[PDB]
Design an enzyme around this catalytic site. Structure first.
Site, PDB file in Angstrom:
ATOM      1  N   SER A 175      -3.482  -4.558   0.899  1.00  0.00           N
ATOM      2  CA  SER A 175      -2.500  -3.752   0.184  1.00  0.00           C
ATOM      3  C   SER A 175      -1.547  -3.131   1.204  1.00  0.00           C
ATOM      4  O   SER A 175      -0.902  -3.864   1.952  1.00  0.00           O
ATOM      5  CB  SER A 175      -3.223  -2.755  -0.728  1.00  0.00           C
ATOM      6  OG  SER A 175      -2.323  -1.984  -1.526  1.00  0.00           O
ATOM      7  N   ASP A 185      -0.731  -9.749  -9.692  1.00  0.00           N
ATOM      8  CA  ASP A 185      -0.674  -8.506  -8.951  1.00  0.00           C
ATOM      9  C   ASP A 185       0.381  -7.581  -9.568  1.00  0.00           C
ATOM     10  O   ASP A 185       1.564  -7.852  -9.520  1.00  0.00           O
ATOM     11  CB  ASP A 185      -0.424  -8.798  -7.470  1.00  0.00           C
ATOM     12  CG  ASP A 185      -0.722  -7.614  -6.563  1.00  0.00           C
ATOM     13  OD1 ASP A 185      -0.499  -6.470  -7.021  1.00  0.00           O
ATOM     14  OD2 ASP A 185      -1.123  -7.836  -5.402  1.00  0.00           O
ATOM     15  N   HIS A 218      -4.567  -7.094  -7.868  1.00  0.00           N
ATOM     16  CA  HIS A 218      -4.335  -6.512  -6.554  1.00  0.00           C
ATOM     17  C   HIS A 218      -5.654  -6.186  -5.832  1.00  0.00           C
ATOM     18  O   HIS A 218      -5.687  -6.173  -4.607  1.00  0.00           O
ATOM     19  CB  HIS A 218      -3.433  -5.286  -6.729  1.00  0.00           C
ATOM     20  CG  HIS A 218      -2.929  -4.691  -5.459  1.00  0.00           C
ATOM     21  ND1 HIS A 218      -2.024  -5.337  -4.636  1.00  0.00           N
ATOM     22  CD2 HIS A 218      -3.187  -3.499  -4.882  1.00  0.00           C
ATOM     23  CE1 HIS A 218      -1.757  -4.563  -3.575  1.00  0.00           C
ATOM     24  NE2 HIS A 218      -2.437  -3.434  -3.700  1.00  0.00           N
TER      25      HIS A 218
END
Length: 254
Positions: free
Chosen positions: A126, A171, A203
């Site tokens: 991330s 995502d 995600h």
């Protein structure tokens, strides 16, 4: 090239090394909030090092499964916690840089004994994946970089470090059309690179034990950190129904 031939099946299980951990207190380091070092035990061998950053709201626990998995395949893996002041991918790149330097030069003798500091990679999730790309651009000594569902507002990274980007099809935070794919597309022409998109994944696919992530991350770090060319085959002629997109350049597939 030591030990048995790798297989698709072997990459998805724990590797042949038992894993120990050393917990690094926040108070013992600067530049990051401590973390956890995973390393092979019952061995006098040396292994390449990998420093990993979890997502922004996360701590090292969120990548515990991957730290253990990678270490079991013959790596010293250092998963960092964030400093509370951190607020962007640039600051996470600073954490990763501090983690690398710690691991190589200031970690306990027992950890340094297990480490081959001449062979080092990075990974992150991330905002940590954004940090990975920024650090690959800053630090040309790195031999491999694996951004997992990377999230960042700048798209161009001038690096020669081999980059394996693993994105998620669904995502909602870092849609691959605006993050992962631009990141891949803007890498220099000669850089070894993969863009792989996990079918139907969120995600936070990287925070759970994942077969594709195991296969591609172990193979990437083996090929690029260890020069173990038997792993190239997992990265070439890829026909993997777990992936809904795949691009590569400069893997030198035969």
């Amino acid at each position: 090239l030591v030990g048995p031939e790798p297989t698709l099946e072997s990459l998805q299980k724990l590797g042949p090394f038992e894993v120990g951990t050393y917990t690094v207190p926040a108070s013992s380091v600067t530049g990051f909030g401590g973390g956890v070092i995973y390393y092979p035990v019952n061995t006098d061998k040396k292994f390449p090092g990998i420093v990993m950053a979890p997502g922004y709201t996360a701590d090292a626990s969120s990548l515990d499964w991957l730290g253990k998995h990678l270490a079991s395949h013959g790596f010293v893996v250092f998963v960092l916690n964030h400093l509370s002041k951190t607020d962007d991918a640039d600051a996470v790149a600073d954490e990763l840089a501090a983690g690398l330097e710690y691991l190589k030069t200031k970690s306990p003798a027992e950890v340094q004994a297990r480490l081959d500091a001449s062979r080092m990679g990075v990974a992150g999730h991330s905002m940590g994946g954004g940090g990975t790309l920024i650090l690959a651009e800053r630090d040309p000594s790195l031999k491999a970089a694996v951004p997992l569902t990377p999230w960042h507002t700048d798209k161009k990274f001038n690096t020669k470090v081999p980059v394996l980007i693993i994105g998620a099809e669904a995502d909602t935070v870092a849609p691959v059309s605006q993050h992962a794919l631009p990141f891949f597309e803007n890498l220099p022409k000669d850089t070894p690179k993969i863009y792989a998109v996990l079918c139907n994944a969120s995600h936070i696919a990287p925070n759970s034990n994942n077969a594709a992530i195991k296969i591609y991350t172990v193979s990437w770090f083996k090929l690029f950190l260890c020069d173990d060319t038997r792993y190239r085959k997992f990265l070439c002629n890829v026909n993997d129904p777990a992936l809904c997109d795949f691009k590569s350049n400069n893997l030198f597939c035969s």
